[PDB]
């Protein structure tokens, strides 16, 4: 049909608006972030230098994506020359590669060592951050060479005036590129989206599950033996009155229950049948006022208030220390950065795998199908561009340390 033409022409209004917003917000946000990391000495040494690298991949994504490619939506003929069309997707593919790979090395270095007092997990090597930044950019350049080598320009003579263009050549010289030509939509999706997100989520989960276990060791060392904490869990499951309420509680409340078990034993905790039933029914304020009425509070008021506060609040506010602040800070920064990425490259990566799997020219239901696919793909482009500019903002909102470091540059 001739319907989706109006969609493309109308969307030209959206892309020019987004790209210009993305450009201004992108250059300012990453520059601020970049100046912040190098002004601070602890972050210059700390693994947050990887975030300074990510700010470079984002900032470089901005200055290749917005200037060159937005120029090609306005100008119908490709006007930069032959070398440039090998260079631009090279630059853009390597740039995205930097952003994903900076995320991965960040979470791996965070799991290797949570903070300065931590012990590196395996194969400690001095000044790893410098070594890791070098490896990230090289691999990002490598993954983008297939774009650069195969990108030549083709001349077409259109229905109106003639116009030359540039895309990835279908006719290719090496069997290397002939393979890459067809399987690029997967390569772009199976790598840039899957491997970075699979690797980063895996270490983030390993790290957060380790943080929790150490916070339990931390809270028990505060109120008063790693095998003792696991034997308590093993013994809680064996006790019949504690297993059901235990399985219902979340890891935070399970810890306070574990804390209660370390004082009185299983037999002693099993007596709060009124309070245990209230915890199962999620009536937190009730049991908190009800646990205050216990003799347990009178024997040790200070410690009980914290355990009661932990049951009431569900967060370690009563157990806040140096570690628990740091563990929460790192985990929130890593989590927020991956979530920003995933939500911005899913719409685009999902556009591609949906177009390759089920698309055929024979049917006439295309113009309802095609209209749906081109629209969602154009948004995915604006999503991916938004990621390049929404990373520096994301750190301010969910990182107390970054929100203050920006405020230090403010004043
Ligand atoms: C990270 O790599 C990608 C993985 C999956 C999808 C896209 C990817 O990178 C891309 C991507 N890769 S691509 O399809 O192979 C490509 C590269 C280069 C060109 C030019 C303009 C001819 C030089 C066309 C198409 N193309 C575009 C995109 N932009 C404008 C319009 C048409 N296409 N946006 C992406 O995302 C970033 C958004 O600013």
What string gives the helices and strands in order?
Answer: HHHHHEEHHHHHHHHHHHH
How would a crystallographer describe the biggest sheet? 2 strands, antiparallel
- Structural class given helices, strands, pairing? mainly alpha
The tally of strands reads 2
Helix content: over 70%
CATH class of the largest domain: Mainly Alpha
Question: How many separate helices?
Answer: 17
Distance between the termini: 59 Å
CATH architecture of the largest domain: Up-down Bundle
Distinct compounds present: the ligand COc1ccccc1Oc1c(NS(=O)(=O)c2ccc(C(C)(C)C)cc2)nc(-c2ncccn2)nc1OCCO
CATH superfamily of the largest domain: Rhodopsin 7-helix transmembrane proteins
Shape summary: elongated
Number of domains: 2
PDB class: signaling protein
Keywords: alpha helical, signaling protein
Assembly: monomeric
Entry title: Human endothelin receptor type-B in complex with antagonist bosentan
Account of the protein in words:
- The PDB classes it as signaling protein.
- Keywords: alpha helical, signaling protein.
- The assembly is monomeric.
- A two-stranded antiparallel ribbon has the order 1-2.
- With 411 residues, it is mainly α.
- The protein has 17 helices and 2 strands.
- It has 2 domains: 299 residues, Rhopdopsin 7-helix transmembrane proteins; 101 residues, Lysozyme (Orthogonal Bundle).
- Bound molecules: ligand K86.
- The ligand COc1ccccc1Oc1c(NS(=O)(=O)c2ccc(C(C)(C)C)cc2)nc(-c2ncccn2)nc1OCCO binds next to helix 3, helix 4, strand 2, helix 7 and helix 15.
């Amino acid at each position: 049909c001739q319907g989706p033409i109006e969609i493309k022409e109308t969307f030209k209004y959206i892309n020019t608006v987004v790209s210009c917003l993305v450009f201004v917000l992108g250059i300012i946000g990453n520059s601020t972030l970049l100046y912040i990391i190098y002004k601070n000495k602890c972050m210059r040494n700390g693994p947050n230098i990887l975030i300074a690298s990510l700010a470079l991949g984002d900032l470089l994504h901005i200055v290749i994506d917005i200037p060159i490619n937005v120029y090609k939506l306005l100008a119908e003929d490709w006007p930069f020359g032959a070398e440039m069309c090998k260079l631009v997707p090279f630059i853009q593919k390597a740039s995205v590669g930097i952003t994903v790979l900076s995320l991965c090395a960040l979470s791996i270095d965070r799991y290797r060592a949570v903070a300065s007092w931590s012990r590196i997990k395996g194969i400690g090597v001095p000044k790893w951050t410098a070594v890791e930044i070098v490896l990230i950019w090289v691999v990002s350049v490598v993954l983008a060479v297939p774009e650069a080598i195969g990108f030549d320009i083709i001349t077409m003579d259109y229905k109106g005036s003639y116009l030359r263009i540039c895309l990835l050549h279908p006719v290719q010289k090496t069997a290397f590129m002939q393979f890459y030509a067809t399987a690029k939509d997967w390569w772009l999706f199976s790598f840039y989206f899957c491997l970075p997100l699979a690797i980063t989520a895996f270490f983030y989960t390993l790290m957060t599950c380790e943080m929790l276990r150490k916070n339990i060791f931390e809270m028990l060392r505060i109120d008063e033996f790693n095998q003792d904490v696991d034997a308590a869990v093993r013994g809680i499951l064996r006790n019949a009155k504690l297993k059901p309420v235990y399985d219902s509680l979340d890891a935070v409340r399970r810890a306070a229950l574990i804390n209660m078990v370390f004082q009185m034993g299983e037999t002693g905790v099993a007596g709060f049948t009124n309070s245990l039933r209230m915890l199962q029914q999620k009536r937190w304020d009730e049991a908190a006022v009800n646990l205050a009425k216990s003799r347990w509070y009178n024997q040790t008021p200070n410690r009980a208030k914290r355990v009661i506060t932990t049951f009431r609040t569900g967060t370690w506010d009563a157990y806040l220390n140096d570690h628990l602040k740091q563990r929460r800070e790192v985990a929130k920064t890593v989590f927020c950065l991956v979530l920003v990425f995933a939500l911005c490259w899913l719409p685009l990566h999902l556009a591609r795998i949906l177009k390759l799997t089920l698309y055929n020219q024979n049917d006439p239901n295309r113009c309802e199908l095609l209209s749906f696919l081109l629209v969602l793909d154009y948004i995915g482009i604006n999503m991916a561009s938004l990621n390049s500019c929404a990373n520096p903002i994301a750190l301010y909102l969910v990182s107390k340390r970054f929100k203050n470091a920006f405020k230090s540059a403010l004043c």
